[PDB]
Amino acid sequence: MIGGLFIYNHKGEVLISRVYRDDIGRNAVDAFRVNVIHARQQVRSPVTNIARTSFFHVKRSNIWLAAVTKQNVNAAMVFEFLYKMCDVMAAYFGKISEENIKNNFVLIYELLDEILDFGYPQNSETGALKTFITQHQTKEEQSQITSQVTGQIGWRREGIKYRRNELFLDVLESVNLLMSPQGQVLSAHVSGRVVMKSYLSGMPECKFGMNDKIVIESMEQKLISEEDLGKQSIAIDDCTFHQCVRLSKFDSERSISFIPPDGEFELMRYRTTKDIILPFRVIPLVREVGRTKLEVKVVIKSNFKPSLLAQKIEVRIPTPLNTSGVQVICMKGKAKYKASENAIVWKIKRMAGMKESQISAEIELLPTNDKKKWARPPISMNFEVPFAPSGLKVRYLKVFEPKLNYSDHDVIKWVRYIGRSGIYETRC
């Protein structure tokens, strides 16, 4: 399993380093410093072998985070681990930075040693760890933490009580689209996640469900209510879950039923393509004037309901490999250009539901080769919109707690619907 584990600053120094196994060397830490962090040959992959040793790493901030083994460990696993780790270190102090890391030695270690033993990753969570990691008692607390960590609901449960009793679900949905020269969705998909932020009491059993096929016909009922046969009720291409959902029980009953972590944890990832809602249409065309003008055109359209708010608009349009004399125009928002880095970026504040906006560009031409041309890179989009681009909406969230008296009716429950960018192309 995991042998070396080592964290570096951007200039190449270690920040923390901890070795679980005889296999590893002073050699290791160096070599990585030497070979990934420094090879003139940037382009890589994220795992390496140097000399029968394998080296995985992530970058965060500009702060490298390497794990090392000299066996044939499970790839995936060691990765997921470095991820879980970064989440534990944020969990303890959020910003993962050089000064933030340096000023935390002793913790990081107590953790490192705890989180993962002999390379075997242990109980990795953060609701176990926060309960026995300082930054004082007897047998009580002792076997408490023991049996909690060892048990079947580590991951963040003990005996919990809140002054105000609430839960927020966030539906965060990325629109991934690659769409041919003149409008035709070549890659057409939406990757979604349900971020649940929950402040609850005790051992609250949650059931959960969404849009998935039925037909229709307190003291705070809505004023209007539909009736009219809510068709297109949408089912889910594929959903993967979190550690807490009883996947046996789900595989069986198609319910999403669990006991949750406290705080802001992610409950499922899921993807959809069917009965998909259209996003933000991009229309890109380049033409010529004389022997010395290349002219670039981008038209932007949007596909909403009448009433709605398109936010944080960013459009990337490329200059040719080199650029003579750039000339950019806007009809809404504000325009940005960056040279030697060679690209053009449009930034828009607010765009209404079902608009149409123009963006123009010009580029001069003088002899660069002997008769050789250019090839145009895809035009790329960044955005936020409050629709739920798949057409998902949360149907239900059952909240039963057997220990304490209270159940479902006592809970403030809020829901948000956010529709982020992801992957978004063309100009051909």
């Binding site: 839960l167 927020f168 679900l169 307190s218 949360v394 969230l397 429950k413 809020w414 829901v415 948000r416």
Partner: peptide, 6 residues
Amino acid sequence: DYQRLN
């Protein structure tokens, strides 16, 4: 912002 669940 958000909208009540229930």
